[PDB]
Design a protein around this ligand. Structure first.
Ligand code: CL
Lengths: 140, 140, 140
């Protein structure tokens, strides 16, 4: 049993005032471990390597589309860099609707890189349960 | 080459009589290995650690929504615990429709924990091909 | 820090003339490493083992459905084998629409196996940004 590898699973909460979400990180099912830092809406990478990244956001209801982006930031570039984008057009039947949107992929990251999630529209996101909207990464 | 880590990929089959699905586990592409147990519709975790979990269910067609939950059960709690929920409202164009719904995330699990998948409606699930509905986990 | 494990993240580009997509593999965020080969629209597995596989394709707009398949080919079988299928029916509101479709699961593969992605309709795929359509795998 080795690792000790950095790992984090974060879950949704009521957002206060493309916007980034902020996160639960220790309560319920969320957690961070092995030097992973969740701070200031970011995941802070402690070790350069290849990570698998994910998030699902569930959206629920007059807009055109919903969109998620998981986004990397480094002080090397400080142009921020877009790793994953889920974008879906919306079908105006209700209109009490909801759609999950889910991403995950692998990326090579520098120690010190920053990760956040951004949505088209913070007021659409379902913040109510921890298993509907979340965001996670681990070192491979 | 180490691991020997527990790993399982399960695939869909015709369900007999929120309901849990049951699974193929050795035929075709499914499998379990390294002490993973598939029994009684559960995945039985043999080693406490962090696992990545997934399932896609494809649904196909007068209902409101479809929903998947991947769900953990322990004899510690025996309140069952909801790890992942995909829920989507349905668009009544056809109505011969179908939608895949896909989840996966990482979780810290006790050896002895139980995992199952639950759907809003067993009669909606496409059981026909193994690559449309499935469910899987591995130790990280 | 061990591995040295085979790993690849590939991203979308303008397709030239079920069709397989072809891929970016070194520029931007794509890459292959540790003996992984991307050639002739395939991912060529260099080591038998269990791999986690994924792809999202985003589709954008008079058709019935969209579909992705990730597909394995070996010279053992040369019947090609379907590992993952995302299929979704389409809702003809616009009709400037778009839908992401995302798969990933674990599979046991022979060294020498070949992997490709196939879609229902190459002209529907959004090729414009690298974070909308992609395809990836790593050795577990
Ligand atoms: Cl959808």
């Amino acid at each position: 049993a080795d690792g000790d590898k950095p790992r984090a699973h974060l879950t949704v909460v009521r957002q206060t005032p493309f916007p980034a979400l902020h996160w639960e990180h220790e309560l319920g099912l969320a957690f961070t471990k092995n030097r992973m830092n969740y701070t200031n809406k970011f995941l802070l990478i402690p070790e350069s390597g290849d990570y698998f990244i994910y998030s699902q956001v569930t959206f629920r209801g007059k807009p055109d589309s919903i969109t998620v982006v998981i986004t990397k930031v480094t002080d090397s570039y400080p142009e921020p860099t877009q790793l994953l984008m889920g974008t879906k057009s919306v079908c105006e039947v209700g209109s009490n609707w909801f759609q999950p949107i889910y991403l995950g992929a692998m990326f090579s990251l520098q120690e010190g890189d920053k990760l956040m999630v951004n949505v088209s529209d913070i007021s659409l996101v379902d913040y109510t349960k921890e298993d509907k909207t979340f965001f996670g990464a681990f070192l491979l």
